[PDB]
Structure 1
């Protein structure tokens, strides 16, 4: 049946290297290493008995520069013992991972057993063959109008959630997980916290438990107290689990990677620990590739019924799109959901500013077959009129309300009744995409039929 067992029944001795040439920052350098690998995750034993894992990063002749995830602190040349496993970091995966809470490095903190591995998969993964990919054309009804109508999330989409520090991005992401469902017919959530607060992790865990998603969710929690070097591997572990459960098990998976800003801060700390290129704002020049190896593990593949949707939750430092984390994440991912501090202060939930938001995979996955015919034109017209509303609001602020034209007044009314009634939703209110489109048509019927220039004439005649 399965021949992967035969290679498993092999014992490989590991060399214990007491020869530690030196240590600096998070990098511990070994000497007299016999044929070092390039990513051999080692088991570095401290003088006090603590065992920290580390993986080599640069291997000159008879030398290996190990970085330890838990930190060098306490490492001594005379007493530390480093054993080379001989293979890269491999997460023990199985179908029983669903319903278990793991630490940052995959060690189970659910007070339960060690995961009874069905396979050992490298956390770094491999690029999915573009010929083997399938373009995601199956719309997900997230239940929130700002994401279903204005934007649109497919099944294989990797649309993240751009947000600031204090915004309710966590409540939006938990809303999406508790409401995600195919428009025209469950999601095994894989949640990866990186440097989140205890309050955030507790909120996510309690939300999953109360909504019943905990029976099909595998948390990889890396709190702020957890070491800042294993934030690099936590999304890799969670995404390897998601890739398993999706491709090799045929389960649709929501991957929620919280605090990708914290992941990128860990990446910048690791890079600055070395003599890496500073990129922009101190982040490594390889940041794009690293974030690519994170995000691009999503998508569907040919012949396998599983799929992975990645909803990374970013934390923009100054609510700036131009910052490297949001810029690189927008360049890689297939859209973004822009949570706005302006709308949050205005009191709107969800505080989604749809103008910076986008979804590449709306183009296909919305249309006549997936949903009703008018959706694309309605979304385009809504974007145009929302922008006209914001511009007319700025013009009103500058030059008073009297100078505005009839079009500007209509657009201000549309802006008010669009932010107040369309974007705004309850935390537990889910709207069918057709209901959202009907509300959108009410908002467009605010206007006369002539000003809806982005609507095709046939759609406008059939839907006005």
Structure 2
């Protein structure tokens, strides 16, 4: 039976007209009756404006309410702050798929409030380490550079490292439009037996991009599988901390309380870290390294590690947390910590983007640690692993031989290196280079990879096992 009948009790909310002090984004109350630590408040301005705030610290009968949407206008005499009795909690239901939500959980589209199945708490709870199970099958992303040789497994949490101005913010839209299991591609049985979904989460996106996301998911068919959590750059930063927690709570719902898989996207976690700096400095904490709070790693992990398959429940959350390289250096705390928690990295490279390539995925540094789980006979074709290995090897050969073309001249390169230059040109221009709206099935992308590797004679494909060459090279 459903034990949700406990929600019928009404809890009257106290309404304090005792905002004694105001300091930056904080307001300080007094004579408060048992102020809960983390507790959303409906802070009323003198003119009547409701302005949500979150309690940030308590001391006896004083609660330091942190106020969203700035603080200007909050006086000491007329403002009245009302304590909702519980911390912020998203209203969840199996039919939010197709709602573009604001940063703070309110639907920003023209639709109505979600007919909540449950009011799940935001922070959720850590997943029992004994209850995890290893990522197994591919979660195809439609991007040729990512699907074949940077593959993503159901449960992996692999980021897309990105420079400041690179189109990563469009690769996110491409993935969210084209993501999906390979079971429909397998065509051996009903691939829609276990549904798929996505919970996009844009953080710190400027309006010229948030509107692009909304338009590009509405216009294409991706909305009926997506819960787009948009918060703007000028939306309150506390909502910017909230949004990834919101999206991961929705993902945990959709993936464990229901059964459908989900490929959650966290756009520009660097902006989330920027907002976390503001929260840390609001609490008067001293800055840790680089200005980010010392507990950066804890509040990044408490986002990333809310993903992975689960023993018993069939669903699985796949993270692709996109983040902007602050100054294009791995040594920066945010890329470093994310690569220290996540299962790999998928670079987007300025050098390739300046050549006009799209996507500008840089394969040489990008790697998926647990790719080998999502590659094999059962999921994708059996040649996928060796095709990936050989493509990476020949790309490295092509890159260094392109470096040597200017040193030893073109004519003095071994025939392997000449074929490798030809392969690198065709590779970067036809395989990595993918139309923004071109959905390439992993089987189709492997077919292109084979049509690209058959430049070389069978003997020069040393990386591929002969049992695969003897049946895939010629076709």
Assess, with a 3 A threshold, how the Cα gap between structure 1 residues 409 and 276 changes in structure 2: closer, same or farther: farther
- In 1, distance between residues paired with 2:471 and 2:98? 48
- What CA RMSD, in Å, does the superposition of the two structures yield over aligned residues? 2.4
Structure 1: stretches of 5+ with no match in the other structure: none
What SS is found at the alignment partner of 1:102? coil
Aligned 8 A contact 1:71 1:229 in 2: no
Alpha-carbon deviations, 1:75-124, whole Å to 9, x = none?
22222322222321111112232222222111222233222222111111
Aligned 8 A contact 2:349 2:362 in 1: yes
More deviation, 439-448/350-359 = 439-448
Shift of 1:226: 1.5
Name the count of aligned residue pairs. 463
Shift of 1:423: 0.9
Alpha-carbon deviations, 1:177-203, whole Å to 9, x = none?
222222234432322222212221222
What SS is found at the alignment partner of 1:131? helix
Shift of 1:435: 3.1
Residue number among 268, 271, 278 corresponding to 1:259 in the alignment: 268
Aligned 8 A contact 2:172 2:267 in 1: no
Shift of 1:152: 0.6
Name the residue aligned to 1:299: 308
Assess, with a 3 A threshold, how the Cα gap between structure 1 residues 18 and 178 changes in structure 2: closer, same or farther: same
- In 1, distance between residues paired with 2:280 and 2:418? 52
Aligned 8 A contact 1:98 1:217 in 2: yes
1:100 aligned to 2:111?
Answer: no
Counterparts of 1:414-453 in structure 2, within 5 Å, are 414-453=423-462
More deviation, 401-410/425-434 = 401-410
Shift of 1:448: 4.5
Assess, with a 3 A threshold, how the Cα gap between structure 1 residues 267 and 397 changes in structure 2: closer, same or farther: farther
- In 1, distance between residues paired with 2:196 and 2:44? 40
- In 2, distance between residues paired with 1:408 and 1:320? 31
Name the residue aligned to 2:157: 158
Name the residue aligned to 2:182: 183
Alpha-carbon deviations, 1:47-84, whole Å to 9, x = none?
22222222223323333222222222222222232222
What SS is found at the alignment partner of 1:44? strand
Shift of 1:161: 2.3
Assess, with a 3 A threshold, how the Cα gap between structure 1 residues 246 and 76 changes in structure 2: closer, same or farther: same
Residue number among 249, 271, 294 corresponding to 1:285 in the alignment: 294
Shift of 1:229: 2.4
More deviation, 16-25/217-226 = 16-25
Assess, with a 3 A threshold, how the Cα gap between structure 1 residues 17 and 321 changes in structure 2: closer, same or farther: same
Shift of 1:451: 4.6
Aligned 8 A contact 2:176 2:200 in 1: no
Shift of 1:457: 4.7
Shift of 1:416: 1.6
Shift of 1:21: 4.0
Name the residue aligned to 2:236: 227
Shift of 1:316: 1.9
Shift of 1:452: 4.0
Aligned 8 A contact 2:141 2:179 in 1: yes
1:84 aligned to 2:86?
Answer: no
Assess, with a 3 A threshold, how the Cα gap between structure 1 residues 44 and 280 changes in structure 2: closer, same or farther: same
- In 2, distance between residues paired with 1:333 and 1:43? 37
What SS is found at the alignment partner of 2:237? coil
Assess, with a 3 A threshold, how the Cα gap between structure 1 residues 213 and 458 changes in structure 2: closer, same or farther: closer
Aligned 8 A contact 1:54 1:69 in 2: yes
Shift of 1:410: 3.5
What SS is found at the alignment partner of 1:240? helix
More deviation, 445-454/285-294 = 445-454
More deviation, 281-290/187-196 = 187-196
Shift of 1:310: 2.3
- In 1, distance between residues paired with 2:65 and 2:335? 30
Alpha-carbon deviations, 1:189-232, whole Å to 9, x = none?
32222221222122212222222222333222211231222101
- In 1, distance between residues paired with 2:422 and 2:208? 39
Aligned 8 A contact 2:203 2:267 in 1: yes
- In 1, distance between residues paired with 2:340 and 2:74? 40
Shift of 1:405: 4.2
- In 2, distance between residues paired with 1:220 and 1:56? 23
Assess, with a 3 A threshold, how the Cα gap between structure 1 residues 282 and 401 changes in structure 2: closer, same or farther: farther
What SS is found at the alignment partner of 1:21? strand
- In 1, distance between residues paired with 2:228 and 2:147? 26
More deviation, 146-155/426-435 = 426-435
- In 2, distance between residues paired with 1:353 and 1:65? 47
| TM-score normalised to structure 1 length | 0.91
Aligned 8 A contact 1:70 1:230 in 2: no
